[PDB]
Write an enzyme that holds these catalytic residues in place. Sequence first.
Site, PDB file in Angstrom:
ATOM      1  N   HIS A 107       0.839  -1.194   0.000  1.00  0.00           N
ATOM      2  CA  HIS A 107       0.000   0.000   0.000  1.00  0.00           C
ATOM      3  C   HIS A 107       0.872   1.242   0.000  1.00  0.00           C
ATOM      4  O   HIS A 107       0.525   2.230  -0.643  1.00  0.00           O
ATOM      5  CB  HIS A 107      -0.959  -0.026   1.186  1.00  0.00           C
ATOM      6  CG  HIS A 107      -1.817  -1.284   1.228  1.00  0.00           C
ATOM      7  ND1 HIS A 107      -2.856  -1.480   0.395  1.00  0.00           N
ATOM      8  CD2 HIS A 107      -1.702  -2.437   1.983  1.00  0.00           C
ATOM      9  CE1 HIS A 107      -3.409  -2.670   0.634  1.00  0.00           C
ATOM     10  NE2 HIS A 107      -2.695  -3.266   1.608  1.00  0.00           N
ATOM     11  N   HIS A 116       5.833   6.694   6.608  1.00  0.00           N
ATOM     12  CA  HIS A 116       5.472   6.322   5.274  1.00  0.00           C
ATOM     13  C   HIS A 116       4.899   7.547   4.645  1.00  0.00           C
ATOM     14  O   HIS A 116       4.741   8.598   5.323  1.00  0.00           O
ATOM     15  CB  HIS A 116       4.414   5.170   5.250  1.00  0.00           C
ATOM     16  CG  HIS A 116       3.124   5.536   5.957  1.00  0.00           C
ATOM     17  ND1 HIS A 116       2.964   5.403   7.292  1.00  0.00           N
ATOM     18  CD2 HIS A 116       1.974   6.139   5.483  1.00  0.00           C
ATOM     19  CE1 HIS A 116       1.727   5.850   7.631  1.00  0.00           C
ATOM     20  NE2 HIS A 116       1.150   6.348   6.517  1.00  0.00           N
ATOM     21  N   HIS A 139       2.018   9.051   1.371  1.00  0.00           N
ATOM     22  CA  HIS A 139       0.933   8.863   0.422  1.00  0.00           C
ATOM     23  C   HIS A 139       1.280   9.818  -0.692  1.00  0.00           C
ATOM     24  O   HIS A 139       1.663  10.935  -0.372  1.00  0.00           O
ATOM     25  CB  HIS A 139      -0.398   9.263   1.092  1.00  0.00           C
ATOM     26  CG  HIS A 139      -0.708   8.439   2.330  1.00  0.00           C
ATOM     27  ND1 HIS A 139      -1.421   7.280   2.275  1.00  0.00           N
ATOM     28  CD2 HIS A 139      -0.277   8.575   3.654  1.00  0.00           C
ATOM     29  CE1 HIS A 139      -1.526   6.768   3.542  1.00  0.00           C
ATOM     30  NE2 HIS A 139      -0.797   7.528   4.370  1.00  0.00           N
ATOM     31  N   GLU A 152      -3.326  13.393   1.751  1.00  0.00           N
ATOM     32  CA  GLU A 152      -4.616  12.962   2.347  1.00  0.00           C
ATOM     33  C   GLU A 152      -5.355  14.177   2.968  1.00  0.00           C
ATOM     34  O   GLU A 152      -6.490  14.529   2.578  1.00  0.00           O
ATOM     35  CB  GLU A 152      -4.339  11.849   3.396  1.00  0.00           C
ATOM     36  CG  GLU A 152      -3.680  10.645   2.714  1.00  0.00           C
ATOM     37  CD  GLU A 152      -3.944   9.345   3.440  1.00  0.00           C
ATOM     38  OE1 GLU A 152      -3.561   9.237   4.623  1.00  0.00           O
ATOM     39  OE2 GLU A 152      -4.510   8.418   2.799  1.00  0.00           O
ATOM     40  N   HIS A 192       3.734  10.655   6.928  1.00  0.00           N
ATOM     41  CA  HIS A 192       3.142  10.349   8.196  1.00  0.00           C
ATOM     42  C   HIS A 192       4.120   9.707   9.118  1.00  0.00           C
ATOM     43  O   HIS A 192       4.606   8.645   8.772  1.00  0.00           O
ATOM     44  CB  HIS A 192       1.979   9.383   7.969  1.00  0.00           C
ATOM     45  CG  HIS A 192       0.786  10.079   7.401  1.00  0.00           C
ATOM     46  ND1 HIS A 192      -0.179   9.466   6.723  1.00  0.00           N
ATOM     47  CD2 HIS A 192       0.485  11.433   7.371  1.00  0.00           C
ATOM     48  CE1 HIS A 192      -1.102  10.390   6.326  1.00  0.00           C
ATOM     49  NE2 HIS A 192      -0.671  11.575   6.682  1.00  0.00           N
ATOM     50  N   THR A 250      -5.802   6.313   8.359  1.00  0.00           N
ATOM     51  CA  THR A 250      -6.347   6.606   7.067  1.00  0.00           C
ATOM     52  C   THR A 250      -6.354   5.370   6.150  1.00  0.00           C
ATOM     53  O   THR A 250      -6.751   5.476   4.982  1.00  0.00           O
ATOM     54  CB  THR A 250      -5.579   7.730   6.375  1.00  0.00           C
ATOM     55  OG1 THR A 250      -4.245   7.302   6.033  1.00  0.00           O
ATOM     56  CG2 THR A 250      -5.626   8.988   7.238  1.00  0.00           C
ATOM     57  N   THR A 251      -5.890   4.232   6.655  1.00  0.00           N
ATOM     58  CA  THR A 251      -6.049   2.986   5.899  1.00  0.00           C
ATOM     59  C   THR A 251      -6.823   2.020   6.775  1.00  0.00           C
ATOM     60  O   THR A 251      -6.800   2.132   8.001  1.00  0.00           O
ATOM     61  CB  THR A 251      -4.706   2.289   5.576  1.00  0.00           C
ATOM     62  OG1 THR A 251      -4.013   2.051   6.804  1.00  0.00           O
ATOM     63  CG2 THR A 251      -3.829   3.196   4.709  1.00  0.00           C
TER      64      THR A 251
HETATM   65  N1  LIG Z   1      -1.961   6.613   7.104  1.00  0.00           N
HETATM   66  S1  LIG Z   1      -1.805   6.527   8.842  1.00  0.00           S
HETATM   67  O1  LIG Z   1      -0.722   7.382   9.527  1.00  0.00           O
HETATM   68  O2  LIG Z   1      -3.123   6.924   9.478  1.00  0.00           O
HETATM   69  C1  LIG Z   1      -1.321   4.815   9.137  1.00  0.00           C
HETATM   70  C2  LIG Z   1      -0.886   4.472  10.386  1.00  0.00           C
HETATM   71  F1  LIG Z   1      -0.920   5.401  11.368  1.00  0.00           F
HETATM   72  C3  LIG Z   1      -0.501   3.164  10.669  1.00  0.00           C
HETATM   73  F2  LIG Z   1      -0.141   2.905  11.913  1.00  0.00           F
HETATM   74  C4  LIG Z   1      -0.452   2.149   9.713  1.00  0.00           C
HETATM   75  N2  LIG Z   1      -0.020   0.822  10.112  1.00  0.00           N
HETATM   76  C5  LIG Z   1      -0.946  -0.265  10.442  1.00  0.00           C
HETATM   77  C6  LIG Z   1      -0.080  -1.529  10.754  1.00  0.00           C
HETATM   78  C7  LIG Z   1      -0.961  -2.753  11.185  1.00  0.00           C
HETATM   79  C8  LIG Z   1      -1.810  -2.365  12.420  1.00  0.00           C
HETATM   80  C9  LIG Z   1      -2.702  -1.123  12.107  1.00  0.00           C
HETATM   81  C10 LIG Z   1      -3.629  -1.523  10.952  1.00  0.00           C
HETATM   82  C11 LIG Z   1      -2.792  -1.859   9.698  1.00  0.00           C
HETATM   83  C12 LIG Z   1      -1.919  -3.103  10.037  1.00  0.00           C
HETATM   84  C13 LIG Z   1      -1.923  -0.624   9.289  1.00  0.00           C
HETATM   85  C14 LIG Z   1      -1.834   0.093  11.666  1.00  0.00           C
HETATM   86  C15 LIG Z   1      -0.847   2.518   8.400  1.00  0.00           C
HETATM   87  F3  LIG Z   1      -0.873   1.660   7.352  1.00  0.00           F
HETATM   88  C16 LIG Z   1      -1.255   3.835   8.123  1.00  0.00           C
HETATM   89  F4  LIG Z   1      -1.592   4.054   6.839  1.00  0.00           F
HETATM   90 ZN   LIG Z   2      -0.489   7.458   6.321  1.00  0.00          ZN
END
Ligand SMILES: NS(=O)(=O)c1c(F)c(F)c(N[C@]23C[C@H]4C[C@H](C[C@H](C4)C2)C3)c(F)c1F
Ligand SMILES: [Zn+2]
EC number: 4.2.1.1
Length: 257
Positions: free
Chosen positions: A61, A91, A93, A103, A116, A195-196
């Site tokens: 993703h 990470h 987006h 986002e 993020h 956001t995922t």
């Molecule tokens: N876009 S975000 O900052 O809101 C965000 C996270 F904070 C995250 F912590 C994560 N990681 C996880 C890792 C695993 C536990 C939860 C649910 C899934 C699998 C995504 C959080 C993520 F993919 C993500 F996009």
């Molecule tokens: Zn994110």
Amino acid sequence: HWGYGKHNGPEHWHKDFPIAKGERQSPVDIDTHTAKYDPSLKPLSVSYDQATSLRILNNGHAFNVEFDDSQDKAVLKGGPLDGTYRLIQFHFHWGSLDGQGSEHTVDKKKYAAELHLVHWNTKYGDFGKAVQQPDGLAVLGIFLKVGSAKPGLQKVVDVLDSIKTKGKSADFTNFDPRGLLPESLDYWTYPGSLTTPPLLECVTWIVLKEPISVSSEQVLKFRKLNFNGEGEPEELMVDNWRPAQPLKNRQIKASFK
Ligand SMILES: NS(=O)(=O)c1c(F)c(F)c(N[C@]23C[C@H]4C[C@H](C[C@H](C4)C2)C3)c(F)c1F
Ligand SMILES: [Zn+2]
């Protein structure tokens, strides 16, 4: 199953994750004019001096740069927060084009990308427990616009060819996340969600007002990554952002002006 295409994109998530339509979903548009200045908000404290990066991963993703969060090494505190939150990963987006990718939006403006930095509340002992709490996470959002290169991001861009497809990872030690921060730490803050999927409503969002600049060549390299695994047809990893969700009964506070 969920992803970012026509058949499994953000508009489909609610069927597996009904919280998609809930009361504190993220991201949101930040209406700079109706965000309430709060002179009692503290300066954000970013303590990244002792950060230990470990690995970079394509999870299908986005890509995550992961940190050793087994001691208090890189933490966020202060700002609107009451605890100490340990950095677990960052990470991004981004878009298929420089005109979109972020986002959060600012007065409907979309940025080319959004960083993020994900942190978890030390009182809950680890990340998996923290996401089950309404104050489990603090995510620092930083917008990226295209212009001059960000020298501090280049080590990240340079390794992406090694993790092109879903599931690949590479050693990624000694990466200093302070080289991704803009000059100012002025921010907006509101209560929201991942956001995922699973879209858990566990996030205090702290979004920096000042974007960082990255070069067109930097963001072009994000766009060479793949959603698919090594065995499979090439779907470029682009437009992995969720659009703005209804603010509903929430107020966005500003640390400034
Ligand atoms: N876009 S975000 O900052 O809101 C965000 C996270 F904070 C995250 F912590 C994560 N990681 C996880 C890792 C695993 C536990 C939860 C649910 C899934 C699998 C995504 C959080 C993520 F993919 C993500 F996009
Ligand atoms: Zn994110």
